[model samples]
Each structure stands twice: as structure tokens, then as C-alpha cells.
Target: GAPPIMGSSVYITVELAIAVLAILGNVLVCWAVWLNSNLQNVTNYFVVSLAAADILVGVLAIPFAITISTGFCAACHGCLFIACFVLVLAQSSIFSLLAIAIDRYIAIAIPLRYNGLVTGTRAAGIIAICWVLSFAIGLTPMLGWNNCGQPKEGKAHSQGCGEGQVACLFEDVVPMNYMVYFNFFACVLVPLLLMLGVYLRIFAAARRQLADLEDNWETLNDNLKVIEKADNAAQVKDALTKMRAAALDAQKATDFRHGFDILVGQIDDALKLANEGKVKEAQAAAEQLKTTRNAYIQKYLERARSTLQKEVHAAKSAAIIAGLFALCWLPLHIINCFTFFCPDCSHAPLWLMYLAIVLAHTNSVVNPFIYAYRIREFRQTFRKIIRS
Candidate 1:
């Protein structure tokens, strides 16, 4: 292999720490889904399977990688197998995330054309397809897409693949063609951009929903605020009748008498006051009556706004999830590109590659907690499991 950029001990320790953290975090995610029926929906099915992918990485991938990258490999054939195994695990998570983004995008994009065909079992099958295809993609290097026995160099098959190495290095065993073209380009970059685009579109849908809520808020406010006029006491049937059905429904949502009932009673009171034709006392009492019920009108508006406000934050949270993925993973993909495009450029430091490797591993650790805390069903179930 090459010389150590940092000490091998520091590198392995970081790997073990990330692997262990991912192991524990995903255990809670899987446990929450297993114990609670509320999490049996298709969304958590996507998430919990991703947790399984992380568990395989933490449990099965990292420990073997340390042995391959730094341990004795003058004769061992372990590097190729472990490399493929890790690839399958990483790609499963990647594919599953893109599937989830597509799921959300479809629902928000086509609200009426959605169907119940996406049951829990169907979601499981979708995850199964990702893992199946991931194996095929990862197995290509073993099936002759590798850097074995270079004709340009004097070394035999043992030198390039796994056997004659001073130590097993992953970058040397795996071909740059696979890394730059297939692994990073096809698998990582395309899916990441689409995930970003889907969430970007979701942000607009939530804003449109907020605007609709605003339209209703204005309609209720405009109609209810007009009851003070002495002459238009009869505007009740002509104008207020248009909004009466919607106003009544909105008031029923809060169980408080504020919209149709309040306006109608106020109009009747104003009509009774006009019997004396507004002696100053009569008009003043009528004016005072309008305000007492007007106080709670805002209560319904606040509740409605708060509900929609939470919905917007959830959409923002989804966008942040996609952004976080790009921040963590793009470095490694870009670093891989350096070898393909600027192989002669020696200034691209080796430590950046190692740091990018560390970054990608930590992403596996992070998403378990991201889903655990962001979705309340998972959060609550995880809390109970922790308390127990």
C-alpha cells in the first residue's frame, strides 16, 4: 500500500467509534419499528430497512475493513469480499433514501392519483429490490471489472488485486473506473441530485398549502369584520350568505361560537337597535356587542396557523436531511474524481481522502438519530424503549 497519512491506530479508532455508534443508534430505530404498530406504515418501512443496512455496516463491514486496509495481506484474499460487502451496505442505504424521496415527491406532486398499492409489504419488496441490485452492482469488480494483473506494469495478478501488496489498500484493489464512473457517478451523484430536487419541490407544495390557509383566514376575517354597519344589517343574506357554509365549518373545528353564529346574532342585535333608529346609546351598545365575540375569532386562526406552521417545518426538516447527505458524501465523490481527472496532480492530499471516508461513515451514524427524533412515532417509541 502507501504510507500512512495519519497513524494507523488513530484511523482504526475513528472507524470503530463510528461503527459502534451506528450500531447502537440503528438498534433503537429497528426496535421502535418492531415494537410499535403505529410505525408499520410504508414510510417507516423504508426507514427501518435502512437501519438494517446501517447495522450490517456497523456489525459486519468496518471490523473486516480495518484488517484489510492495514492488516497483513501478502497472501489473504479478504479485501475483495469485504469491499463488495461494504458496497452493498452503502448502496442499500443510498437507494432506499432515494426511494423515500421519490415517495414523498409523488404524494405531494400528484395528490389525487395516489393509491393504496404501497402497503407495508410492498415497501418491503421495494427495499428488497434495492439490496438485490446493490449486490449486482458491487459484485462487478470481482466479476472482472477490477485492477488485476496490469499489462502496462510488470506486476502479476497478485500485485494489483490482493496478494502481493505490502498491505491491502482499498483504493488500489478497486479500480478507479468503478469508483469514478459507477460508484460515485452513477450511484451517489445522480441519486443525491434527484433527492435534492424532490425536496426542493416539496417546499413549494407546503407554501401553496399555507397560502390556501391564508385565503380562508382572510375570507373569515373580511366577512366577520363587516357587521358594524347600521345600514347593511341586511347584508347578512346578500353577502354573508356566500361565505356562511365555510364559516360555519371553520367555527365548528374549534368548538367555539365565533364565525357564522356570532355574525348572525350580531346582525340581529344591530337590527333590533335600528328599531329606535340609533339614539347614540343604541348604536354604542351595538358597537360594544361586536367586540366581545370578536375576541375569540383569533383563537381559531391561531390554531389553524400553528398546525400549518408545523407542517412547513416538517417539510423543511426533510430538505435539511437531503442537504446534510450532500455535505457529508460529496467530498468523497469529488476526491474520487481527482484521481480520474487529475492523476498527475500530486497536491490532492491523502488525508482528504481519509477524512472523506470518515465523513461518509458518520452519515450512517447520523441518519438513525435523524429519523428517530424527527418522526414523533419513532421518537416516542424510542423514548419508551429507553425508559424501559
Candidate 2:
């Protein structure tokens, strides 16, 4: 009979394939965002950083992960070197995702200060810091500091300490302990609380804007008046109405463009207030962002019509990503923290593992699509390239 494949082996194979595609796709996105001066915004910077991290994971880690999953006893020198790079890459991605969330929260919640808060220089600095931190995190594992139960923890399982047979084993749990705590604090707990608070405030602000819009729209309807009867000069009246409608549309587009810029500043101000420990000021800033958004909507209402179908979709796309985070990562974290002491046998089932991995990787895999779908410039540029 042929040898049966292990379940773990199958999972590893799928993971490798996913990782490969993610790397290529993300690399293209990063290049597109970086090389194109028109695409340089704080949001795009975060996205580019994310793509770079994914590429690193694809190049450095997936191969070693595959080897280990397949029960390889040892790795080649090249594999070991690549594994280090992979560790850093994975670390970079987790942290960069957090940064992206933070930037978005700021951008949406405090429009006035966003320009100063998320400048090109600051974003570059943040990206550099993420790389440095990831490398530091990766280096700790590579060094002997992660000596859990290994060389000196005890003699009970020190059979091959001399042979250096295991890079990290159960005996090395002590050093791994630090990593466990580090990952939980930075990647799990801290980001969760921060993002939750920020996003909640943002949603609240949006709701308030919607309420304001209803009122504004009603007020505009009341104020609207027919200046005079136009039957005697129907042609001239028709031209005037058309001109007014065109002007209204132009003004509405201007309002939305202004709103986008202002929202970025508002987000930055809110963050500044929060960091300064002035909760009241931060909340006030969030409320102010809502008022500004409402003003934009009011402008749109007065205008005849526009093709802002796409801009609204961009904001909605951001919301969908937020929703996905809540549905996917939040549950995984809840399960992990809960299972730390109260392990239910059902928790570690095959289905759950697959579900978690698939959802988490969805964040990685959907990058190119999100850009193509929600970003106008990217779409236009892509079409131009295709035609050329």
C-alpha cells in the first residue's frame, strides 16, 4: 500500500501555496504604490509596508515551515538563513497590520490633524521602526537566550544538548515563555484594545454624521425656492437650471475632496489627544470629525448629482475590512485567551485550525483585490497599462 499523507502535511502544502501567491501579489502592490508618486498617501504607505512584510514571509519562512511540518530532522544552512529572515518578515507583518489599523482610525476620527500626524516622513519612519522591531524580535529566537529547558534548564531531557540536535524543544520552554508574552502583549492584547476604542469612536462619529445629514437635507428642502415663473423664457430658464445643476455637482465633488483631507487631519488630532491622556478632548475631536463629514454630506445634498458612487465605496470597503477583523481575528484571540486555562477538546479540532488559518490568510490574500476595487487611481493606472 502507498504511504498515507499526514493531515499536517496537507495543511502545510496548502499554506505554502497560499503564501507563495500572497508574496507575488503583495510585491506587485508594493511596487505599484511605491513607484507611483500619485499613490503616495499615508494609507498607501501602510499598505505597501504590509505587502513588503508578506513578501518577506513568502521568501524567508514558508519553506522552513514546510520542512518542519513534513517532519524534517534538520535544515540546510540556506534554509536556516532563510528561516531567520522569515521570522523577521512574519513579525513585521503582524505589527504593520496593527499600524494600519491605527492610521485608519486616526484618519477617519480626527480629520483636522491628520495631515500633520501622518506626513510622508512620519510614515516612512514608522515603516522603518516596524522593520527594526521585527528584526529584534527575530534575533532573540536565533540567539541562545531562548534556552527554555535546553542547555541548562535541567539534565532530565539533556540527552542531545551536546549534539545540538534541537534548535528549540520542550526543554527550551523557558525562553519561549518570553516570546509568548511578547506576542500576546504587542500583537494580541494591546492592539485589540486600542483598535476597538478607536473604531468604536469612528463608528459613533459616522452615525452622528448620518443624523446630521437627515437634518441638513430636510433644512435644504425647506429653503429651496423657485425664484420666478419661467414659461415666458423657457429656453433661457432651462439653460440656467442646467448651469446651476452643473455648478452644484462641482461644489459637491469639492466638498468630498475636502472631507477626505480633513478626515485625515481629524484622525491625527484624536490620536494626539488620546496619547496625551485627554479622553474628553479625544472624544470631542471625534465628534468634530462627524460634523465635518456631515457638512460634506449637506453639500452633496444641495448639489444636483454626482458620480461619487466610487468614493462612498472606498469608505465602505474600509468598513468591510474592519468587519472582517472583528469576525475573524477577534474570535481567534478570544478562543486562545479562554483556552489558556480552560481547554475544551472542541477548540483544537481540525475544523477550527483550518478555519482560523484560512480567515487569517484571507487578510493576506485579499490585498490586491481591495486595491483594485476601492482605489480609483489604481484602477485607472492598471487600465492604462493594460491598453499600452
Candidate 3:
């Protein structure tokens, strides 16, 4: 309705390019997930659904954006429909992401039950529901359920809601409008809050998994050592007492022969040795043993420390990812709320509005990249596609 965010050739070109890239990337994501049997899973299904929503943005929203920028207003009715359709698609993407997050949480939090709980069919059903709800919400405005009041002079929809030279879907920035509240809660707040909670549980599950593995490693090591020591002692314990008793009876005869042999050699020499003479040498050997043992102990501590460091790093990475997701989307929500709730808020600088729009659009662009980078299955599939 209004000119594209900037209306400059450079900015419009950038927007178009972003839209094109988003389309290409999301299409590839959907294709890779669908074509590869290895990629077929409840989670991947949600990802494919998300890609579909992103594709809609490229197909419907960006083209309409281009139309508006070029001052082509053939039919305000068509423009209004496109606006609703774009809103539906964008919301669909958000809900799809929420579905993915929940799927991840279930998989991590309860691996044993995940297959039963989140079957492929059930996942598809959920995705269908998400799209249906998005459509229903998006259609509300077009169905005359919106609270969009009379348009102010020099603005889009100057002739008021539904009857105008330019029909935009947004309400004027005056009192808190029902549509604004609806959009804020339906599109932004609820999904984000749910995602945050799900990711929190996912991270907790990850931490627990790592901790359990570490404990198991330590326990297994200790059990192996115990079993080895028992096995070694088992042989000696059964033989030593019985055999020593038998040998004692024959010791008198053996001693007589050994005494005569030793008398002419080390026995006399050992008798002449003093306790103090050997004690000093024994102490010196003990000190050397302690030094070597300390080195081994230090190595064991270093390995334990390394394991803990890795666990910390993993947790931090998870936290940073969740934080980035919130940060990237929060600004747009704030701007939306401000624009709707504060009458003068529309007077915000054009650059600021542009930045908010870019930030909001960035989530779609970033989602595919995240899949390619963070997800091993997707990454391998991407590589295979490139190679082929």
C-alpha cells in the first residue's frame, strides 16, 4: 500500500535479492528433506513445512511489495488479499518453528517414547492445524472482523477500512486496537514464549544426558578396575593358604639344604647389614615413586577438567542460540506494539522502521542456514546436493 520500506532503487533491489535468496534456500531445504529417505522424520517434516511458509513469502509478499513500490494499484482488493495471505504465511512459519522446537524437546527429553509420541502422521496433522489456524486468523481482517478505523490524511487506506484507493491491513496507531493485540499475541508473544520454554527444557535434557554419560564413564572405569583386581586375587586366594600349609611341612628339610647354600654366600652378608643403611635408600626410592605418582594423578585431573569444560561449552552454546533467536525477533515485536499502541509512534524515523522490517525478515533467512549448519542430517544432505 505504502511504498516499499525505502523506495530507493538500492534498497528495493536488496529486498528483492533477499526474497529471492530466501526462496531458493527454503526450496532447497524442502527438497533435501523430501528427496532423502534418511531425512524423513517428524522433525524434518516440520522443517519442510517451515520452508513452505518461507516460499510463500517469496512468492506472494515480495512480489506485492514490488508492486506497491512501483505505484501500481490496479485493485486495492487484491492488495488487501495479498496482505492477508502474507500475514498467514509468516505466522505459519513461526508456528512451524514452534512445532520443530517442541519436537526437539520431546526427542531429547524422552527418547524412548519419542517415536510413539511424535509419529510422522501425528506431526503432519499438527502442521496442518497450524496452517489452518494461520489462515483463519489472517482472514479475520478481510472478513470485516478488524478494528481498523478511519485512515488519517496522507496515509495508505486514506478512504478508511475496506473503501480506499490503497487498502493496507494494519490499523492506525491510535488507541490500542483489537487487531494489534490479536496480532501481537497470536503471531509473536505466544509462539515465542512457548519456544523459550521448550528450548529451556531441551537444554536441561541435554545437560542431564551429558552428566549421565560422564557418570557412567566414571562408574564403568571403576567397575572394570574392581573386576580386574578381584580376578587377580581370586587365583592367589584359592591356592596360597592350602599350598603354604603343604609347603610348611617340607620347609625343615628344604631349610637345611638352603642354609648350607646361603651360608657360603648372601646369608652371611645380609646378617652383617644394618637397618639404618637400608632405611635411607628405601626412603629415597619412596620419594621417586611419589613424584611419578603425582604426575599420573595430575593427568587424571586434567582429563576430568576437560570433560567439565566441554559440558560448560555445550550449555553456553545452547543458551547463546536461544538468546539470539529472542534478540533477533524481539525488536520487531516492540516496534509493532509501539506503532499500534502509541499514536505518535508512526513518526519514528524511516530508517528505524526499515531496520525493524529487515530484522523481522531475517528470521526466515536465518532458519535454513541454521538447519544446514547445526543439523548434521541437513548438513550432509546439503553437501551431497552440492556434490551431485
Candidate 4:
């Protein structure tokens, strides 16, 4: 279950690199949002929200996760509770994603009154709610149901940690079963499912409006046949006004396609390859995806990413952020799910487990850059930093 010195040294280097990049990059995200008035809009407020949460992930969680994961940080209470604390904190990005999703859907669904509906104060209001929601989940294990005593559920008598403690591996103090079931399955998976429902609904909603635009481009054929058989100027005049507005929304669709605008994004197809346990297919798929996505992403990123409006760019970036959220985490979460459904058959190696964690942390590393390159506020700001 342990690794060689060579593995340990390389792993430590990777972890340190992740921490350093995540910290500096996310700090720039918040700082760019702060000092730039153009970025002071409500949608970008949520970007700063995610950046704030990531800063904690880098500074405290990343470094300490080493000792915490390695079974070195020990105490009657410190290791178990703090792991609960930091893990839960890192997951606030999920809550932020949920908020951003709901916010975007509301904006799209009610475009007429959206400005009156959502304000900068409301932005922080929801951000605070996300923080509170995360804090509650983080504290749950500590408040009531940790494996503090011996044989709480007939397992972990091996631990025998009544008042005194045992060797107190992370897997011990925090019940292994507790993790996959409660945290991963219940909390993360459920929230992710809800996010999916919300996202698809947003896409479906936008699809209808675009369909309306297409129909109007014809002659309002169905509606005109009803009233304007050759005679209704009143209906035709109102319909003409509405079509012009819909035409604008149609053009807006071309600005930046939302992440799910493709039925199966390049990432999703790779997710399919991975799920099948097809190693050869998986390798070539990733290689192809990297090549294609780079060419396509920069095709838009360089030419017009910096030109999109706040809400338009926000939806585009937020969806990509969540898409990566799925990409990075789904692997870890699936491996996590693998522990159960038969922990017996699943004799997963520590290296595989470590790889999943590395993948998820790397998500934090790439997300800031996605916006820094793919969204304007940060794109130009990062442009300055790059050339600076």
C-alpha cells in the first residue's frame, strides 16, 4: 500500500507545483475582478466567488492534504475533523457552480426583467449562501457522526479508538464507508445531478427561443396563417417588432456557444471511453481530444472571446467551468464509487487513488486559465500579465 522513494519524490513535486500554480492563478483571478471596473458586473461576481473558494483550496487544503492523506497528521481530534473541514471547504466550488447555474438560468429565462431581478448585492447574497451551505456540510461529521469510539457500526473495532486513538489513518478516523456513501455519493453526486437537470433545462429553454427566431425568419408561417390570411396589420406589426428582438438573440447565440451546445463535447466522449475500461481507446481519445480542443478553443479564444458581453461570456465560461468540474471530478468520484458496490473486488492501488486526486486538483489549476484565456475580463488582463 506504500510507494517507493522515487514515487514519493515525484508525487511531492507534482503536489507542490499544483499548489503554487493554483494559488498564484486564482489570486490573479480575484485581483483582476477587484481592480477592473469592466469586470465589476454581477456575473463576474460569481467568477470571483469561485476564485475565492479556490484560493483556500490552494493555500490551506493543498499543502495540508499531503500530511493529512499520508497518515502523518495525528491527534485525538485534529486529523479527522480537519480533514472533514478542508475537504468540505474545497467542495464549495460545487455550491458556487450551483449558484452560477441558477443565476444564469434565471437571467436567460427572464431577460426582460433580469436586471431588476439580479443585482451585485444579490450576487454576494447568493455567494454567502454557498459559503454557509458548504460550512454546514463540512461540520456534519464533526458535530454528530464520526467514528470516534470503538466499533460504532461493528466495523473498525480494528481501530479500537475509544478514548485513546490507534494509528489513526485517514481511512480509520473518517470511516471509509462514510466517505464514499455520505460525502461522495450523497452530497457530491446528488448536487451534480441537480446541476445537470438545471443545465439541460437552460439549454432546452434557449433552444426554443432560437427556434422561434428561425420560424420568424420564414414569415411567421403558422401564426400568420391563423390571423394574417391577407388582412391583419396589427398582428403583423407586433410580430415584426418581436422578430427583430429575436434576431438579436439569434446573433447572440453565435457569440460563444455554451459548453453543452454540442451534444457530446470532446470531454464527454472521452468520459465514455474511460467508463468502459478500454485503455487503448482511452489513450488515443485523449490524444485526439487534446489536439482538436486546442485548435478549436483558440480559434474562438484569440479572435472573439475578448469581445463577448458580460452575461454572454459568463454563461459560456460558467458552463465550461462546470464541464471541467465534471471532467476532473467524475474520474475521482467514479473511483470513489468503485470502493463500494463491492470493496472486496475493488483492490484499487494507492497510486490510482493518488492519480484521481491529482486530476481533480489539476482542475483547479486549469479553471483560472480557461477564463484568463477564454473570457474577456481575464483574457485581456491575463494578456497584460503574460506580456507584462
Best by TM-score: 1
Q: Candidate 3 on 1-388: residue-level lDDT in tens? A: 5654445566567667778887988888988987799888877787788778778777777666555544433244454565556667767867776776777767666656878888988888899999999897766565665433344435544434333454343332212343457766766677778888877777776676566545533542443233233333343223323322322322321134442233222212321221224433322332332232244423433564475445444334334444555676677667667766686755567567557656655555776777666666788888888799
Quantify all predictions' global Cα lDDT against the true fold. Answer: 0.68, 0.55, 0.58, 0.65
lDDT of 3 at 356: 66
Off by over 4 Å in 2: 1-9, 70-91, 137-162, 167-180, 213-315, 322-362, 383-388
| Model 4 misplacement above 4 A | 1-4, 151-165, 220-314, 385-388
Candidate 3 lDDT score relative to the true structure = 0.58
| Candidate 4 TM-score, C-alpha based | 0.71
Number of colliding residue pairs in model 2: 19
Q: RMSD of each candidate?
A: 5.7, 13.9, 14.7, 17.3
What's each prediction's TM-score?
Answer: 0.75, 0.61, 0.66, 0.71
Q: Is candidate 1 or candidate 2 better by lDDT?
A: 1
Over 17-127, each residue of candidate 2 has an lDDT whose tens digit, in order, gives: 778787867876876776678987887787788777667556645554555433232322222343345446656765666676667657655655878888889888988
Q: Candidate 1: worst 10 consecutive residues by lDDT?
A: 150-159
**Tens-digit lDDT track of model 4 for 186-304:** 77778888888887877777666555544533432342232333233344334333433433444455424542233124434534554565544544443453354344433543443
CA error at residue 352 for candidate 3, angstroms: 2.4
TM-score sort, best first: 1, 4, 3, 2
Candidate 3 weakest ten by summed lDDT: 267-276
Comparing candidate 2 with candidate 3, which one achieves the higher TM-score?
3
